[PDB]
């Protein structure tokens, strides 16, 4: 009854884990500090995320870290750029799936 169920539903709908090869590296601080969801030149009205959709930041940090680790060379600071549709639209897309369980 505690721990409202907006998190278990997403955890059950999406399968995004840390791959095997990253086990030897420090991916934790890369998630925490070096994948920034506020883009480089400030707000955009597209990257805005609604207050009651916090799970989306998880998937955003996924995609940032993966896209940063895939390229050769040094790992770089990756910033969020743009979400087609919008934050609320993408959140509603995930939310229908979470609901349908």
């Amino acid at each position: 009854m505690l721990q409202d169920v907006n998190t278990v539903q997403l955890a059950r709908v999406v399968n995004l884990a840390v791959p095997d090869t990253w086990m030897s590296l420090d991916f934790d601080t890369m998630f925490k500090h070096h994948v920034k969801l506020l883009p480089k030149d400030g707000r955009h009205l597209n990257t805005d995320i609604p207050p009651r959709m916090g799970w989306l930041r998880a998937i955003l940090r996924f995609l940032g870290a993966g896209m940063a680790m895939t390229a050769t060379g040094v790992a770089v600071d990756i910033y969020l750029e743009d979400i087609h549709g919008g934050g609320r639209s993408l959140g509603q897309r995930f939310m229908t799936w979470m609901r349908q369980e």
């Binding site: 480089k40 030149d41 400030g42 707000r43 009205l45 805005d48 995320i49 609604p50 207050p51």
Partner: protein
């Protein structure tokens, strides 16, 4: 052209971005002056001739 060759000034339009990224404004709001001026201004060192 020769003013470009001689002058020591150098226009780097990242000052505007670095000063506008430090603005504090909410997210549950359909207007944003920072983004608005960044769009209207479009800092790019393509043609400062």
């Amino acid at each position: 052209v020769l003013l470009q060759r001689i002058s020591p000034l150098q226009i780097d339009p990242t000052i505007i971005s670095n000063t506008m990224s430090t603005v504090s404004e909410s997210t549950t709001q359909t207007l944003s002056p920072a983004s608005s001026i960044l769009g209207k201004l479009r800092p790019s060192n393509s043609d400062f001739s």
